[model samples]
Target: EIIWESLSVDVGSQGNPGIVEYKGVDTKTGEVLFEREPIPIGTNNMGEFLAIVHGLRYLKERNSRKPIYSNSQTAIKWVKDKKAKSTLVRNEETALIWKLVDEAEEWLNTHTYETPILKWQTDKWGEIKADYG
Candidate 1:
């Protein structure tokens, strides 16, 4: 079995538009194995939610049940709840992101996952490898 030490996911934002991006990183190598193009507008919470979902799907496809690390309890709870309660306004500018949010939530609602989504032991590890810092 190809077991990974751990995988990490994180969300980042910048600029006046609140540009958002997220990534999945391998803890052992600190390599970003998965990422999405930054969206023009979105919140860290939204990105964090999507990142976790994506990580779940990716690992599931590989038949790997490795644990995933994320710092946002909101995202972890949202995954456990199988819903993403987004606060972003749904307009042309944010249409794509909202669509993804719905898709992520729909995915969570439809599928059963085995991979554990745990809070990145920030108290012990500082920031996750997927973090921008």
Candidate 2:
């Protein structure tokens, strides 16, 4: 099975959005297949959604069925429902988010199998956490 995972991090105070980082990992080998630069207009939710989008773009091979894992239920729902356009169209600051969502949707339309699963990481020893710390 082709398994892909996405992760996101929120930094700084809750009121002040900070650096948002995201990465996509290949589950079979634990290799990071794609990573986006830290975004200054940051939020945990934004990072999570962007991570899934970037992961889908990276794995956009025709006729390939893959399961994508993420911890964010919101992101999963957005993809499953194909709500990217409706969610971002009116927001001016979401230009980058909208762009990525479009790319993800294009990949989704061409792929044979697209599954979004909820899977979280743990900080405990022996559990593989994607933290770069």
Candidate 3:
């Protein structure tokens, strides 16, 4: 399954303040498929967006019809509605975000499995949430 996490400091500052991290895990075996701690730049919204995108990219090759989970509803909705183009266009860090988003979308489109099921229930992902936070 896809698991995502993100955090940030006070708003509207470019300096390093917090972190954005995500991981893909094998639901059956509890194996960590992939993980990341990307540079945290932008608001909490941006951090959440990057976590989800990076998580998707990490899972692209797993080729499984697994459900993805995250604590960020905004991030999940953004992917489900395919809102990258519009959202990224308005961001100061559009180029990098767009690149990752584009790649994630491409993976979503090209994968043979069913459209990933996105779930957002912190209670259901307590362990992940704790580690992420």
- Superposed on all Cα atoms, model 1 deviates from the true structure by an RMSD in Å of 2.9
Residue-by-residue lDDT tens digits, candidate 1, 18-69: 7999999998898888999889998888889999999999999998868998
Q: Return the TM-score for each candidate structure.
A: 0.92, 0.59, 0.55
Error of 1 at 106 (Å): 1.0
Candidate 2 collision pairs: none
Q: Tens digits of per-residue lDDT for model 2 on 1-133?
A: 2233333221222322445676766655667667677654546655666676666655554333465666556666766665543432335554664566566677656664454454544432233334445
lDDT values, one for every candidate: 0.86, 0.53, 0.49
| Every model: Cα RMSD to truth | 2.9, 5.2, 6.6
Q: Evaluate residue 125 in candidate 1 and report its C-alpha lDDT on the 0 to 100 scale.
A: 73
Q: Poorest 10 consecutive residues of model 2 by lDDT?
A: 7-16
Ranked candidates (TM-score, high to low): 1, 2, 3
Evaluation by TM-score, superior candidate among 1 and 3: 1
How many residue pairs collide in each prediction?
A: 0, 0, 0
lDDT of 3 by residue, 1-133 (tens): 3333221111122433334444555544556655654544434455555555555555455554445555556666776765543333435554554565566667555654443546555475444432343
Better of 1 and 2 by TM-score: 1
